[PDB]
């Protein structure tokens, strides 16, 4: 009866949340009308973890939907699997985020936080054994970045014991889509690093690379990129919802994965991945899955782990397999690329096995990685931030919406200190 309150703020957060609820609704047998039409009774025993019982056989998801526009939230209400949400937790604004962290964090977004926090409080005291909150945001916009981080701060202040999951679409060295991504990323990671229990940094460039190389996929659009994120989010929390020989929930993952409190930036992954021409020629087995997990091209962050060093690794295997095969596969890879692991931590791999595999796959596996190599991302964001902030580029919006440049300086210094911590915990030997 551990409970997760899912929240999504922003356009990208709402899209990936709608895909997440589709991928978990067809896992739990929930129809688009909301009722339970499954027949396997193993599904309808932990359905409370993400859903809430209503009249009849209907189950309303425990999701808080935030957006500062009546646009893509109406789009995800009108799309498929959009009739399952309660209309009460569709708090949205009639303004614009402006792609502005200040606009989302100190103005009209901030007077929406009262309604958002009332909805979150109702959905949190409607539980009995609340495990925590799971926010999926954009980190480069104005609703995902500013409103999301302020919601994180308020919820962390109110409940400073539950588990805070943050799925963040961190900006890429390539692509663009916004000129002030370095500002909206630094000013958000400054609050993430002090208010979040664990952060999964997904990158659209890495998702496009996966679509290139493991799925071919000439025209994947955002649907497939959100589907991979939905599959990862479903695979992380699968031990809470389905039985298994070796369970691991979010608190087990956090304890086994986060050595020091400001070291909770991961690189997620999902690796029963193959193209449509090779889906009936690839045999699902633990060594093949583990090879594709630990392959550096299957990271959903743009950081390449071969230039860094893994601090801790988590691996959750959905399906029915053999524990000796899983354990000896991780022993084999940890013996092979032993230079990619920190010396001061023995047995850098945390294993979990869940019995029920996802749809279509007989055997799936997801990967969580805390490594030094995520510091290249923050170094890049720092370089772009100090490129723009040195000349006050696009700064009058932030400082006239109501802020000071001392917040910008504090965010830059804090994220550079995070870079320094990651760098110091890389080449420091044991004895």
């Amino acid at each position: 009866m551990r409970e997760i309150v899912h929240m999504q703020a922003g356009q990208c957060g709402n899209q990936i949340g709608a895909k997440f609820w589709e991928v978990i609704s067809d896992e739990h047998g929930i129809d688009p009308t909301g009722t339970y039409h499954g027949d396997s009774d193993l599904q309808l025993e932990r359905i409370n973890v993400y859903y809430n019982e209503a009249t009849g056989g209907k189950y309303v998801p425990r999701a808080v939907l935030v957006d500062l526009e009546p646009g893509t939230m109406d789009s995800v209400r009108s799309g498929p699997f959009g009739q399952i949400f309660r209309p009460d937790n569709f708090v949205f604004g009639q303004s614009g985020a402006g792609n502005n962290w200040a606009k989302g964090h100190y103005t009209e977004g901030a007077e929406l936080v009262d309604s958002v926090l009332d909805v979150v409080r109702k959905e949190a005291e409607s539980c009995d054994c609340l495990q925590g909150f799971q926010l999926t945001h954009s980190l480069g916009g104005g609703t995902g970045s500013g409103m999301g981080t302020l919601l994180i701060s308020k919820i962390r202040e109110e409940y400073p014991d539950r588990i805070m999951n943050t799925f963040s679409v961190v900006p890429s060295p390539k692509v663009s889509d916004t000129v002030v991504e370095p500002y909206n990323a630094t000013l958000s990671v400054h609050q993430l690093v002090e208010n979040t229990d664990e952060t999964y940094c997904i990158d659209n460039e890495a998702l496009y690379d996966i679509c290139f190389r493991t799925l071919k996929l000439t025209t994947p659009t955002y649907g497939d990129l959100n589907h991979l994120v939905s599959a990862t989010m479903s695979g992380v929390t699968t031990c809470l919802r389905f039985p298994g020989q070796l369970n691991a929930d979010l608190r087990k993952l956090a304890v086994n994965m986060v050595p020091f409190p400001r070291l909770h930036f991961f690189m997620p992954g999902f690796a029963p991945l193959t193209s449509r021409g090779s889906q009936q020629y690839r045999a699902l087995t633990v060594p093949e899955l583990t090879q594709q997990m630990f392959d550096a091209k299957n990271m959903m962050a743009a950081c390449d782990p071969r230039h860094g060093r893994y601090l801790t690794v988590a691996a959750i295997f959905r399906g029915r397999m053999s524990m000796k095969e899983v354990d000896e596969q991780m022993l084999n890879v940890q013996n092979k690329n032993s230079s990619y692991f920190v010396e001061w931590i023995p047995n850098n791999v945390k294993t979990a096995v869940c019995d029920i595999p996802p749809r279509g796959l007989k055997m799936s596996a997801t990967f969580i990685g805390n490594s030094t190599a995520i510091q290249e991302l923050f170094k890049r964001i720092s370089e772009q931030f100090t490129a723009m902030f040195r000349r006050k580029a696009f700064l009058h919006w932030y400082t006239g919406e109501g802020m000071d440049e001392m917040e910008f300086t504090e965010a830059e210094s804090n994220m550079n200190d995070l870079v320094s911590e990651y760098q110091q915990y890389q080449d420091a030997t044991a004895e």
Partner: protein, 437 residues
Amino acid sequence: MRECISIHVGQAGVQIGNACWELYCLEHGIQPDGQMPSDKTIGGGDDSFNTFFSETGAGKHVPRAVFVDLEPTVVDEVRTGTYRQLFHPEQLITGKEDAANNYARGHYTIGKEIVDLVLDRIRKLADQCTGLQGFLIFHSFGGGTGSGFASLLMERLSVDYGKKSKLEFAIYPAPQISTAVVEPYNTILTTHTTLEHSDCAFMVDNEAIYDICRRNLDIERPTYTNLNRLIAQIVSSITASLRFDGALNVDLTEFQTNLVPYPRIHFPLATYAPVISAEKAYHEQLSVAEITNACFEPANQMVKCDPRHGKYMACCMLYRGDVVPKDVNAAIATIKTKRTIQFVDWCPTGFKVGINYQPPTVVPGGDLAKVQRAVCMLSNTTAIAEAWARLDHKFDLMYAKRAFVHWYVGEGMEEGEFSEAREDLAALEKDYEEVGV
């Protein structure tokens, strides 16, 4: 009459106890519905079940077990499966959230809200007894729901009860493979404080059972269920003398006085023979001498620790089946005349021999063959000091720069307990050294 109480605590404990009670029901002919199949007749003469099962009125046999789990995941399968109408509903004690591989969470915060309930259930199952022998405590050293809550439970149990024996079946970590990362922290902080309140702690190692299943059972990819069945066979070979008559029987009171020379060295290793499969048992001759040599082979120990790098201090011979003590003594003489198996100079004697008449049982869809005889080593030796040395090396490697300590510290656990645990394990290593020399 020779009654005993089994507490299975943690996920590993719950799975092991599941296999153990399956084996016990098959041994005593008790259906999963808790009823005898009504064709037994006899007339009540076969009372060789009261050590593990009560008799609640019409014939419902309620096991003397407490299944404790802070998470509602692996006990709900028991509550919903075919063993649902076998256990008392509050013998399947269930928490609300798991302790998250955290000694502090399993020992102080989540431990001290269900400890009163589990002691109440143990008190009820203990005063519904007429000569209780001891407590078989099944747990893993993984941490929290396992080692942590078992530590708190035994700390309260030693205060509550007296001279009752508390045997531990502990899943010790392997030298190479393990699940958790905070595994050395949990193991050190548990072996610091359960070393004073226990009586005899068998070590079982998952890598060792994997190698046993690969080499002898020929299963290249076993799951945890095969390991649990092998552990259940170990425990059944231990407790068969309390149930079935034999040439000479050994009790739990006889057991600690035979394998604990000094109270700090109560850490034995378990070994079984034969674990050969049905495709090779009927072709290989299986008698007392070669099964004893198979047990004393270094590539059979269920701990992943070679006894060739240590001195045997004491041994528990457990035979069951059509075994004669003349061949037992001949096999023991052939063991003692071997130069590879080296004993210690202060123990010229020592092989506690028990022989039981009941042959080992077989489970449907299992692994082991129908053999007419079997033997169990329960040995106390100086080899496990190497495992303690590896565990302390891992603990110092993690604790040299305070890795993962903030979870324990902010959960409500003072930092000096880590240092005092490392003192206790250093003293354990030094004690093992001075016993060995």
